[PDB]
Amino acid sequence: LSGWELNVMTVDDLQAKHQAEAHAAIDTFTKYLDIDEDFATVLVEEGFSTLEELAYVPMKELLEIEGLDEPTVEALRERAKNALATIAQAQEESLGDNKPADDLLNLEGVDRDLAFKLAARGVCTLEDLAEQGIDDLADIEGLTDEKAGALIMAARNICWFGDEA
C-alpha cells in the first residue's frame, strides 16, 4: 500500500532497530585513538562509518568530540581512507558473485569474461555446467554458435561421457 518494502524478520534481542546498531557491532574504531583508551564515553550519534559527509566538515559539527586538533583530523582522514579502501574491496567483490578461482580455465578457448558471464547466468562450478547446451553457452561476448557447440560437447565428454571425479 505505502509502496515500501517493509522489514519483518527478527523477534530476538535488539529487535527495536533503533538500538540494534548502538553496541551490537562495536568494531568501528579499530586503530583511531592509538595514544590511550581513557578519554571519554564513546560517541555513536555521528555514525563512525560514513566518513563521507563526516570527514571534511566545519568545526561546528565535529565539536561533539573535543580535541579536534591536527593529529585528530589526520587520524580521521586515515580512517576515512581505510574505510574507502574497505568499501572499494566490498564493491569489487560483491559485483562478481561468481568467485572465479583457478579451476575455471582448464579447457582450450575459455577466457575470464566467458567464465564470469557463464557463472553469472546462475551456476557455480563444472558440476552444474554440462546440464545445458547452446541455450546459455551461446550469445556470449566472444563465442559463436559452432564454438559454443564444440565447447559444450567437450564439457559433455568430460562429464557425461567420462564420469570421473
Torsion of CA 64, 65, 70, 74, to 10 degrees: -100
For 137-165, give the DSSP string. HSSSTT--HHHHHHHHHHHHHHHTTT---
Q: Where do we find the cell 564470469?
A: 116
- Residue 141 sits in a domain whose CATH number is 1.10.150.20
102-113 burial, b for 16+ CB within 10 Å, e for fewer? Answer: eebeeeeebeee
Closest CA to 155 of 142, 101, 140, 147: 147
Q: Do 137 and 83 sit in the same domain of this protein?
A: no
Cell numbers of 165, please?
571425479
Q: How far apart are CA 65 and CA 34, in angstroms?
A: 16
Q: Do 73 and 33 sit in the same domain of this protein?
A: yes
Structural domain for 115, as ranges: 102-160
Query: Are residues 99 and 116 in contact, defined by beta-carbon separation less than 8 angstroms?
Result: no
The end-to-end CA distance of the chain, in Å, is 53
Resolution in A: 4.1
Q: How far apart are CA 92 and CA 38, in angstroms?
A: 37
Query: Are residues 130 and 109 in contact, defined by beta-carbon separation less than 8 angstroms?
Result: no
Residue 44 within any structural domain of the chain: yes
Q: How many residues does the chain have?
A: 165
Q: How far apart are CA 140 and CA 113, in angstroms?
A: 9
**Beta-carbon contacts of residue 48 (< 8 Å; ≥ 6 apart):** 28, 29
- DSSP structural state of residue 5: -
Helix ranges (H only) for the chain are 70-95, 112-120, 134-137, 145-159
Closest CA to 114 of 155, 156, 60, 73: 155
In order of 52, 91, 93, 159, the CA distances from 87 in angstroms are: 12, 6, 10, 39
- DSSP structural state of residue 67: -
Query: Are residues 141 and 120 in contact, defined by beta-carbon separation less than 8 angstroms?
Result: no
19: phi then psi, degrees, rounded to nearest 5: -115, 15
Residue 148 within any structural domain of the chain: yes
**Beta-carbon contacts of residue 97 (< 8 Å; ≥ 6 apart):** 120
Residue 4 within any structural domain of the chain: no
Q: How far apart are CA 32 and CA 60, in angstroms?
A: 21
